[PDB]
């Protein structure tokens, strides 16, 4: 009887959360932005083509200086790229070739990498010996690592395949904070501009807002019908966008506690693998399974550009911090810089 | 050529990195990548010990082939989110205990897992090697407790040489794409030396098949 009592109590709390979100819904984002100027056809050409991987590229990440980027592929290699002159700065041999994520530290000193070995490896780029070197192996998960992002040189947050995000300490090597509450396994995370909150999308069609200091789940966003594969904060930090396997991108909202737009089209039936905003937050970039990359303006759901040019699934995407470039990676073992 | 001296030396560093990447890739392309699967309480540890925390990789050489098995049974996550990483393996070794027919039951779970990996969208052209393991105490477990417990449609005798072939035909009938891939099958035990010779012959036929596809002969 106690299980049914708390069951009905949780139903009543979900009903009052739904009633609060319905009472806050006074006008949609389509009804307000019907008077702004629609953006033109965003024509973007392949400036650089980075061709050094020999297997499927699963993740990339930009540097803070908007010139260096790292990319992870399952040929067992992790390559630092000079995006201006197409030079390979470093080539990092991985102990486990089955990697699914990579991160570039905002100081530029470190590079993270992880995957199906349940280990976030931290690589030191700037040593006295001249070579790259693994500094720490953060081994505390039981599921596969799906995303990792540095807070600073000493703190990193990882999302894993065991319905659990974790906050690490690089110097000691243990989990400072464990973030639990998802029921499906978490596929991506995204830090806020002020490194105090992060969102995470899992395979239970829910995205949760996490507080890094206290370690609690603040808000929970349910609008999708399938597994959320990618997530990214808006540049304001008051919104984020998710990309799922139901061929839709959705713009959620932290203060309004519910979704705003759905970025969908009837000719699109494949899942989103990657999502990123522009520098202004006006454009919304999204990588697909039908080998393309589509660009919506975020203020109105209409597709304003197609970044076609890959021959397999666009698995990773990054808009740089200057907004000058978009690096798209794919399973055809090529990175492409778009502008 | 409008490059500085450090730019030219950085290009030389990048070209040396390119040479190392090409050498490592053409070394890695000479290796046989095997995906090791199986149901719960399988006897895969015995044949791994014969052939020798998410993926237990196992590198071993045999008759100038460099095999690398990837024991991924133990990755307790949603398999649909990471099974596309193994697109391009040479074969798949799938381990079934034959004595798990009485312990739905374990054998129907094995059939469901084999049907899930065999008809998967990422392994349409991948051959599957199938060790039907623990055949020794299966042969004495079928003394009492007949196969009607597991397969009630079975009407043959309670002997070993018919029931084992019936279980083999029930697993091989789960293949929907019978034209593209093959299902190699071996009755194995714990004390069985020839478990590496069978996977050697099976990947030899798979390499010959891929070479017939590559050389235009198919």
């Amino acid at each position: 009887s106690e299980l049914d009592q708390l069951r009905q109590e949780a139903e009543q709390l979900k009903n009052q959360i739904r009633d609060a979100r319905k009472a806050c819904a006074d006008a949609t984002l389509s009804q307000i932005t019907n008077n702004i100027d629609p953006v033109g056809r965003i024509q973007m050409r392949t400036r650089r083509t980075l061709r050094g991987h020999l297997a499927k590229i699963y993740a990339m990440h930009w540097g803070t200086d908007s010139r260096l980027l790292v990319s992870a592929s399952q040929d067992g290699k992790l390559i630092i790229w000079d995006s201006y002159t197409t030079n390979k700065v470093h080539a990092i041999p991985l102990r486990s070739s089955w990697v699914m994520t990579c991160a570039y530290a905002p100081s530029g000193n470190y590079v993270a990498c992880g995957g199906l070995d349940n280990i976030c490896s931290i690589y030191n780029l700037k040593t006295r010996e001249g070579n790259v070197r693994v500094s720490r192996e953060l081994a505390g998960h039981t599921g596969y690592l799906s995303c990792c992002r540095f807070l600073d040189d000493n703190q990193i947050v990882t999302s894993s395949g065991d319905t659990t995000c974790a906050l690490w300490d690089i110097e000691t090597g243990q989990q400072t904070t464990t973030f639990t509450g998802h029921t499906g396994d978490v596929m991506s995370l995204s830090l806020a501009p002020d490194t105090r909150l992060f969102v995470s999308g899992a395979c239970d069609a829910s995205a949760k807002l996490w507080d890094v200091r206290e370690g609690m789940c603040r808000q929970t966003f349910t609008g999708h019908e399938s597994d959320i594969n990618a997530i990214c904060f808006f540049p304001n930090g008051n919104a984020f966008a998710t990309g799922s396997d139901d061929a839709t991108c959705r713009l959620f909202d932290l203060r309004a506690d519910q979704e705003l737009m759905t970025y969908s089209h009837d000719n699109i039936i494949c899942g989103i693998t990657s999502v990123s905003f522009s520098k202004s937050g006006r454009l919304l970039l999204a990588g697909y399974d039908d080998f393309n990359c589509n660009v919506w303006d975020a203020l109105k759901a209409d597709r304003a550009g197609v970044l076609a040019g890959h021959d397999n699934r666009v698995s990773c995407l990054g808009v740089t911090d200057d907004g000058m470039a978009v690096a798209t990676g794919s399973w055809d073992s090529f990175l492409k810089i778009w502008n | 050529c409008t490059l500085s001296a450090e730019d030219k030396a950085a290009v030389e560093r990048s070209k040396m990195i390119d040479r190392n990447l090409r050498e490592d890739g053409e070394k890695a392309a000479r290796e046989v990548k095997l995906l090791l699967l199986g149901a719960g309480e399988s006897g895969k540890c015995t044949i791994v010990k014969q052939m020798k925390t998410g993926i237990v990789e196992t590198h071993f050489t045999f008759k100038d082939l460099h095999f690398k098995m990837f024991d991924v049974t133990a990755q307790r996550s949603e398999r649909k989110k990471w099974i596309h990483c193994f697109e391009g393996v040479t074969a798949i070794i799938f381990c079934v205990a034959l004595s798990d027919y009485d312990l739905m039951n374990r054998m129907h779970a094995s059939m469901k897992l084999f049907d899930s990996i065999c008809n998967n969208k990422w392994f349409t052209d991948t051959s599957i090697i199938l060790f039907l393991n623990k055949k020794d105490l299966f042969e004495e477990k079928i003394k009492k407790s007949p196969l009607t417990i597991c397969y009630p449609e079975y009407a043959g005798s309670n002997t070993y040489e018919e029931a084992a072939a019936y279980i083999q035909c029930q697993f091989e009938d789960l293949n929907k794409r019978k034209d593209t891939k093959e299902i190699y099958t071996h009755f194995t035990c714990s004390t069985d030396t020839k478990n590496v010779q069978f996977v050697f012959d099976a990947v030899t036929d798979v390499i010959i098949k891929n070479n017939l596809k590559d050389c235009g002969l198919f």
Partner: single-chain antibody, 233 residues
């Protein structure tokens, strides 16, 4: 990380001698290597360079066709084969490692160097006006230098390096571009400048940063140093 140069001694003029530098403590195979000499009363001048993997070998148009630089990758030594030693080759020969990628610090570690004693045009000219500057600690010292052509390359980088040679020690890298501070170097040192005119500024001094400063260009080969500025008292 260390570089021990060996060989040297008294050599009759017109003879031959091979110098070795056994590297220890770093990835030797991924570093370009330079030999840079220093006359017993004069400053520094570049001699030879071999790249990583021995792909590019440069000489100084004074030893070209006369010295031979070679490196060994498994055994970590660096060789400089010298034939036909004239009287203008008596110096202490320093070995210095140098990596080149985007954002790297070339010329960051210098060997201790060994002594060699012999018996009996289109380059860029570094020019430092002040030969000796007397100074007290706590002050701020602005040392200037100038070039022949503009060291600002078209890609934005300006290739002027600032070094420091303590009395009785090997030179040390201070500033590894026009304004980039090297590792292990305090925040007092600050490089600046533009075009063909550059200035290293010391905000406040200590006792250990006295000695001779040298400026080097890395825009074009051959690499040319300046007549160094001495700081005493």
């Amino acid at each position: 990380v260390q570089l021990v140069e060996s060989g040297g001694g008294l050599v009759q003029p017109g003879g031959s001698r091979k110098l070795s530098c056994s590297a220890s403590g770093f990835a030797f195979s991924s570093f370009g290597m330079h030999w840079v000499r220093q006359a017993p009363e004069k400053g520094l001048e570049w001699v030879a360079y071999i790249s990583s993997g021995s792909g590019t070998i440069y000489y100084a148009d004074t030893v070209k066709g006369r010295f031979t630089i070679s490196r060994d990758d498994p055994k970590n030594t660096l060789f400089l084969q010298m034939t036909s030693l004239r009287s203008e080759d008596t110096a202490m020969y320093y070995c210095v490692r140098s990596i080149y990628y985007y954002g790297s610090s070339p010329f960051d570690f210098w060997g201790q160097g060994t002594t060699l004693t012999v018996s009996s045009g289109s380059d860029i000219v570094m020019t430092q006006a002040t030969s000796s500057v007397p100074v007290t600690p706590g002050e701020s010292v602005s040392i200037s230098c100038r070039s022949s052509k503009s060291l600002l390359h078209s890609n934005g980088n300006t290739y002027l390096y600032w070094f420091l040679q303590r009395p009785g020690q090997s030179p040390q890298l201070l500033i590894y571009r026009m304004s980039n501070l090297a590792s292990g170097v305090p925040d007092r040192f600050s490089g600046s400048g533009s075009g063909t005119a550059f200035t290293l500024t010391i905000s406040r001094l200590e006792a250990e940063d006295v000695g001779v400063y040298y400026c080097m260009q890395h825009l074009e080969y051959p690499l040319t140093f300046g007549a160094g500025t001495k700081l005493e008292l």
